[PDB]
Amino acid sequence: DAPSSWALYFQDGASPSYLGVTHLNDYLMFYLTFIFIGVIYAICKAVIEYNYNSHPIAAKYTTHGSIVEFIWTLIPALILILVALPSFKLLYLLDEVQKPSMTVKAIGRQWFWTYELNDFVTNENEPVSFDSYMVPEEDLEEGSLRQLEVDNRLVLPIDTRIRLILTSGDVIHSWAVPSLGIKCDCIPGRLNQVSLSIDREGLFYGQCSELCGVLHSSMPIVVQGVSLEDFLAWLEEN
Amino acid sequence: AVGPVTGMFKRRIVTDFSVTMILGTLGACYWWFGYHKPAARQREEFYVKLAAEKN
Amino acid sequence: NQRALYYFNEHKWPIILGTWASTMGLSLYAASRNRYDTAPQKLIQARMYAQGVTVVVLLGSVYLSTLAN
Amino acid sequence: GEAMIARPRLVDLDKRWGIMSQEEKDGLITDLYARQKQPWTTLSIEEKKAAYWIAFGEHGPRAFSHISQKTVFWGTVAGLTIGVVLFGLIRTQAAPSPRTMTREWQEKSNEYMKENKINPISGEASEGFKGRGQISGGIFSPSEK
Amino acid sequence: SAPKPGSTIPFYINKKPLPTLLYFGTFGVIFSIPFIVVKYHNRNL
Amino acid sequence: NSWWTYVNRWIFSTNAKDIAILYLLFGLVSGIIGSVFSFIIRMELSAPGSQFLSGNGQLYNVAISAHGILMIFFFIIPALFGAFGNYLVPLMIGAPDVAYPRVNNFTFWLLPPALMLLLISALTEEGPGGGWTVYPPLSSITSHSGPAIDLAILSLQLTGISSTLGSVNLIATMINMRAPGLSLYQMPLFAWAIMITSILLLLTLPVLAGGLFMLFSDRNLNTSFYAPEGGGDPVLYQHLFWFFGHPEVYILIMPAFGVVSHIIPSLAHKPIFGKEGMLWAMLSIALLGLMVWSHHLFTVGLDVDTRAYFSAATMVIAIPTGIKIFSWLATLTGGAIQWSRVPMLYAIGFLILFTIGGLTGVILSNSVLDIAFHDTYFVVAHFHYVLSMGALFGLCGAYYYWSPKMFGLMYNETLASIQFWILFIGVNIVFGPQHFLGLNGMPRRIPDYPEAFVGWNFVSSIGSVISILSLFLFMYVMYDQFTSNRVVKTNPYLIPSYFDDNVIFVNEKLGVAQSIEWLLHSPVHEHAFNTLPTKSI
Amino acid sequence: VKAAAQELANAKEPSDLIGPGGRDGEVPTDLEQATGLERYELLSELSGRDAFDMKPLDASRKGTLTDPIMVTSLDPYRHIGCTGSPSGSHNLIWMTVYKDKLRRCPECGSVYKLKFMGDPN
Amino acid sequence: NWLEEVQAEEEHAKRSSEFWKKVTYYIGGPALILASANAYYIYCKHQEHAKHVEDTDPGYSFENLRFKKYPWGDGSKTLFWNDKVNHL
Amino acid sequence: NLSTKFQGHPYHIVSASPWPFFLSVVLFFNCLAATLYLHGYKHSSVFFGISFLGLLATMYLWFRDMSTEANIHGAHTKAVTKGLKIGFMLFLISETFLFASIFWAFFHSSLSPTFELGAVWPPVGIADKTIDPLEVPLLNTVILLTSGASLTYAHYSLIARNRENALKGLYMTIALSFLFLGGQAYEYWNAPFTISDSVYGASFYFATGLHGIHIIVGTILLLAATYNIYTYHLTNTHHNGFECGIYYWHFCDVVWLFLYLTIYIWGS
Amino acid sequence: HGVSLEEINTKYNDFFSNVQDQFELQRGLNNCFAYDIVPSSDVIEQALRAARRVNDFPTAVRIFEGIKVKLPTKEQYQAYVKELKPVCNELGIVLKEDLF
Amino acid sequence: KNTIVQQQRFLQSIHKPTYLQRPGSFALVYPYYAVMAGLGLYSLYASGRVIFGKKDA
Amino acid sequence: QFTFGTVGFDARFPNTNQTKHCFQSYIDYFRCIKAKGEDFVPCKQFWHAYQSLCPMEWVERWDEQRENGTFPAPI
Ligand code: HEA
Ligand code: HEA
Ligand SMILES: CCCCCCCCCCCCCCCC(=O)OC[C@H](COP(=O)(O)OCCN)OC(=O)CCCCCCCCCCCCCCC
Ligand SMILES: CCCCCCCCCCCCCCCC(=O)OC[C@H](COP(=O)(O)OCCN)OC(=O)CCCCCCCCCCCCCCC
Ligand code: CUA
Ligand SMILES: [Ca+2]
Ligand SMILES: [Cu+2]
Ligand SMILES: [Mg+2]
Ligand SMILES: [Zn+2]
């Protein structure tokens, strides 16, 4: 959910949209590692075994080939098809539309996010909206994560489809959370749509991924999944 | 007359190709059966343990 | 008829592009049968003929489209 | 050329060939060519040695520049050492580090991430988690005292 | 116009004693321009 | 007076081969500044917090933007496509000189003023603060309210003029002024690569010119092309720019393909394997480089079908390129190899690093996977591992291969090998850990980062330091080459065959070569080719 | 044709290549207002000969020590690219045919000899 | 030989040039005057002017944008601005 | 033997040419002066004008040398007069690709109108204050179409060794080009929408100004050609400077046809 | 794709049978030991006889040097030298490994 | 009115570079050099003004 | 008290882009209330459709524009 020290591979996440990306990446790496090792070994071996002091006589009359070239052109095609089939099945499965039960808005202002929910508008007449500001270093609570903590963090329920609508007001921003495998661009004038579904009950961190000027490094994103009762209590508070 | 001797380039090329293919297959198989499957097992075990604990 | 006439103005752009291309090709093919005419000289006449035919058909289409009553 | 050449004119020609004059070289090669038309069974062993050295020698067209790989290795090692030392020397001319780069704060963060259940599979909130977590260690965690 | 090139056409002259200072000095200015930019951007803070 | 002769020779010149040296030296001069800017960037980005720049963000943005522009527009293209595209093509195809002798000089002399304009821009109140690809909304008058980003666009327009006007006379030269008996299909592979790069430049540059002028007018003449308030779409600029952005990442690389193709067989004593295959692979890559440009816009939110197609037409490029690699491998198996020579060292080092970069590129071609790597350090690792390892290494190999012909002096070998090894190790260590940093999810273009991305950056800074020592060593060896007085033969890369005698070779087999440029004297004459060479019909 | 050949024959220096000139009221033709190299090419083409030497190499036949292939040149050398027996035999190899010396191909053994159709000094 | 080819080429050029002169003098002429007359007629057909409408849905939020003031004139005027047809 | 006193190859050898070093400097002056002027720096309007005059002067001085070398030195042989056509064809291709960027911008802004424009391409309000394509534009296109016939007549008359007709045809072509430019300027000065008005105007003016510049260049080329003819310089079989302007004129004609077909009729 | 390798052997035997030029012999040998095939003992017989005819002892030794280089195993080279020993004694040529 | 041949012959007696070959060409060259020198001298000062943002007043 | 309910899938706008959804919902709702009557219950549905998507920073601008009569739409 948060970066570790000296980490190598992905970080633990919880989302159906995140369980596919990592699996596809492992599948693709399975094919790519073999090619990498084979090519490097062949390149290294072709020189040790044919160096000048061992093979003075060159085979200058063999600069042709008609069966080797066909295999060269064919085998990579098969590899590409094999890798491609899941990469399309997963894409089209993921892009389809479910039946969302809630909606949120994540307007990306200049150097702070503005979250809004208007679904619950009723005789209460209090649509909920707030702004997320990065906590300064001096104000950090003991043990907190520097450069990744916010005063107000988005709160959502788990095991419930959510539809995120993203836009901006000043420049091009990007809402990005790797733990949930979400990355979309907020462009001023158009509403981008994304699907989201929390799975565990934890905290998830992220940062904006499109430079917006001088404070591109101080727009953290924090999502907290809580049970239904906790979400209802939190909503009633606001 | 000891007769002509030929068929040297093919032997060397075939040997190099075979060893390269063996090494590549070994590496890929180790990657797929040494990292991915244990990770999937751990994730499934954790999720089932959480679900059981929920009760 | 009154149906093909409505079809004409229902699709007036593809017919214009098609007739321009057809005039270009027809003129280019017809002119490729002489001796003292360099290739650019041959292409220039095709350009002129195509432009003229396109202009006349554009005027015709503009006149025809008026029947929107 | 039916008479053999004197022995001293051909002994260890490899080293002597380095310092000579064009006249002597031309005379020697032409004499060898003249004496090579007789049946080879009558040629002295030293004459054959000299002829082979002159023909398929290690001079003239085939005399390549030698590179001592030992020197290359030692030069690369020295360059790497100088680079590391220079980086270390210009590292101590920077601003003071933040207040969250202390081993105590790292330990507090490691303990705090377990309460909130962050990375609860193979991270700081796992079951056993005998790993490091957020303590990068070394000079990156100068435990305050 | 049929001369034999002298085996040198480098856009300048190089000797040991004096020109070596100029060759390696001009290298310093190009190496230092960005430092000048950085220093000039941090004077009105 | 020597002043008049000097001015006539070097400023009012019209000799094709006497302008290439100017291109090379200017490219090197710009590359020095680019490398120093990169060194500043990497020293700042070592440890968490504000280390060296006193808590400034605009300065860092200026640094990255200037570094990218300088090292992609003023260093590789002029020092590789122009420096070696003018000196060798007329010689290689067997022509007296370029078709238009003074248009080439005019094309060259547009660079110094452009560099001066860019420096003045970087020295203004704020400077370019939108990266090497300025984007409309962040780079409009609202944010950058000064005459800082206007100059940086005029400089790019001037460079585009120079490139698109110097890429026309090359085509007009290789079409009309070939040696008798030699056909287009039989030209050397390097000339074919230069032709293809010229075609791509000629086709794509004006689109970027138009887009950049639209952006420039949007700040001063009150147009509303990229303003969502007036009725425009800020995403149009992305389309217009990246329609040229990709066809420019093939222009950069292809001359390296040609250089390696001409370096391998020469020092391997074996003809290239399947020349027609390589020619057709190059043509296919060139053709397919124009139909895939929007794969840089996967997260913008295009409809599903467009993403699916643009992801299907990006993997295909991996078929032809791959062929080329195999061919070079097929060339090494069988022939005598002299691996100690510096050009061979660079040629071999090119293959491994470029193939790693290309595989990493294939990783992030799928639309599904790109969401986990877009605008992270994985992209930085990929494109650096391709550019600063396949283009820079190709450039260094070409220089160390053809320097004795241009200048007529032989450099030192031990120092060249030491420099190569230092550069190899340093760049590998620099760009290794960035892969892990990107994988873990650390964005790019941030002077500061979270607390857990420290180890890998601290490791990479050391290599970033070492590479500068490599550059210093290269400068010293280049200097020592000019003041050593080491004559070089006509064709230094000719050695007697296995059975060739030491006198028969001397007096009956000299003056032979597999390319024309190795027949002329070492400091090639001025008015060469009084009578054109002939080839069997 | 005869007039062009006669005019070309009787001329000492390149400065003597000037046409008779045209007349006012009508456009002038190339035969009367061409000077320098252009007039040289025009006159040589009209006369039936070749102005410049751009004839490809003689692929047919194989050279021999007693019957070499003649390569004409205006200079004491001329670079030639040998391909051997009917074009396509062996790989292309470039070489320079020195004056008064026989250039023998290192692969197919063909022999070429220079013909100095030019001014010694 | 040369004379015959030159004569034939000149004859062909003369015939084609005469044809094109006839085309441009007998086809391209009447159309020009007809088009000019049509333009004059349509222009006269609506010579009413009175193009002074104010407050009728003014601005619309996408007309007369001022991001940066112009350098010429006072600072808020275009190049070919006209005070008889263009209103603010 | 006169052959030994000449060169072996037909290509051209040039010397000196100090103009390339000055054109780049003048361009630098122009760019800097424009940047200064647009932001309103004192004492920076005369700079721009003097820089433009310098640019024109240097370009004229350059183009004088080519005429001197081709009409006196006699260095334009049978082969050197083919690269001068291949280069022009390549330049025309480059301009053709440049001209498509503005069309792409127009199409992207038109096919999918934004909500603020009312969802209809012609922005609400601006629809009723457009220009009739059955007006001055039709006269302009007819003029540009009938100019080509005059140009072809002039060229063919020149080939057939006739002087009066060639000059007459060039006169008519230049006059018609001037009339077209005047009509375009008149239409510019009587439009009810400025450049900074939505995107429709910002695209219309942007697409028309480039064509205006191109046609001005073509007219200057034709003027140079006619002046060369009048001096008894161009021959009947070697008139490269004329065949190099014919192509430009006809390319401009085709581009105008496409522009009028798209912008005036469709996008309105 | 053309001629096999057996016809190559016969062709090179025929070529080596008749040659009277040092350059010819050297280029023929250069092009022969590059075809992946080491000729039979008859071809070496003819090559050595030709070398004797043109009076070039160094080539007479270099032929055996190349035979040794191209062969993959020591036993085959030993058999080769054994087969051609009587000619070596007759002509007086000395193998490289024995000279020094 | 056809002096083409006469001047063609005359102008070939001058060996000066092609941009000075025609008689009376210095008048159109040296003033141009002076103008360019003045423009460059002003350009340096203009760039200096731009760097230190300031408009004359 | 709180019930989860929002706008479901719509065939007209299946793509990722949804810029036109809010605009269409707004226009349709206002046309709806213009006809029939303000008390029409089904009309109210469009209300929610145009409140769950529009960022609420545009709805105020549209209302302010519609006040005077500068709204760039028929209604
Ligand atoms: C010379 C420069 C260069 C070259 C050659 C390439 C080559 C490739 N590039 Fe890249 N790229 C860049 C320079 C380059 N690139 C730059 C500068 C950026 C960042 C721009 C920015 O900052 O906005 C970038 C960004 C970039 C992105 C954008 C990612 C994102 O931002 O989200 C993508 C997406 O697919 C991509 C893919 C590729 C592919 C598929 C190739 C292919 O051409 C690679 C071909 C090579 C191989 C395929 C390996 C060799 C082949 C074999 C060994 C055969 C076997 C292979 C298989 C079976 C697959 N690169
Ligand atoms: C050719 C292109 C090129 C080259 C060579 C380089 C070289 C280097 N680059 Fe960079 N870089 C880019 C193109 C290049 N780069 C681009 C396009 C971006 C994106 C900018 C943006 O986001 O807008 C970028 C961004 C970029 C970043 C990301 C910054 C950020 O996002 O915050 C970093 C981080 O360290 C970096 C570091 C380096 C380092 C340490 C080197 C060097 O140390 C590598 C080693 C090279 C040398 C030491 C040079 C040696 C030179 C010679 C030996 C001369 C040879 C000459 C002859 C033979 C004539 N560069
Ligand atoms: C020049 C090279 C360009 C190369 C790239 C191609 C770009 C397209 C072509 C050029 C732009 C044409 C615009 C339309 C022309 C027109 O006629 O504009 C018409 C409009 C006026 O209309 P109005 O609203 O008054 O009408 C009202 C009707 N009632 O004038 C303008 O507002 C200003 C346009 C000219 C501004 C010139 C500024 C130049 C700055 C320097 C440029 C860089 C020089 C250095 C280059 C190396
Ligand atoms: C925005 C895009 C446009 C930018 C402007 C580009 C302008 C330059 C375009 C190139 C034109 C010349 C190419 C052909 C040269 C050639 O081939 O000349 C070859 C001929 C040879 O004569 P001959 O062999 O016929 O004589 C035969 C005797 N027996 O010499 C000439 O006639 C020189 C002609 C000079 C005039 C050309 C037009 C100059 C440009 C006008 C516009 C200037 C303002 C531009 C403002 C931006
Ligand atoms: Cu918002 Cu970076
Ligand atoms: Ca930092
Ligand atoms: Cu790309
Ligand atoms: Mg992005
Ligand atoms: Zn041969």
Author numbering:
A (entry chain B): 10 to 247
B (entry chain I): 2 to 56
C (entry chain L): 97 to 165
D (entry chain E): 39 to 183
E (entry chain H): 22 to 66
F (entry chain A): 2 to 538
G (entry chain D): 39 to 159
H (entry chain K): 38 to 125
Study authors write:
Cryo-EM of the S. pombe CIV purified in GDN yielded a map with an overall resolution of 3.4 Å. The map allowed construction of an atomic model containing Cox1-9, Cox12 and Cox13, with overall structural similarity to CIV of the S. cerevisiae CIII-CIV supercomplexes. As with other canonical CIVs, we identified a covalent link between His247 and Tyr251 at the catalytic site. In the current S. pombe structural model three lipids were modelled in Cox3 as phosphatidylethanolamine (PE) based on map interpretation and similarities with previous structures. We identified a density attributed to two TM α-helices in the S. pombe CIV at the same position as in the S. cerevisiae CIII2CIV1/2 supercomplex. This density could be convincingly modelled as the two HIG1 TM α-helices of Rcf2. Density for an α-helix near Cox12 at the p-side of the membrane that we attribute to Rcf2 is also seen in S. pombe CIV. However, it lacks sufficient resolution to identify the amino acid side chains and was therefore modelled as a polyalanine peptide. The S. pombe CIV structural model shows specific interactions of the fully conserved, second R (R143) and Q (Q147), of the QRRQ motif with Asp254 of Cox3, which is a highly conserved residue in CIV. Furthermore, the data suggest that the C-terminal HIG1 domain of Rcf2 does not only associate with the CIII-CIV supercomplex, but also with monomeric CIV.
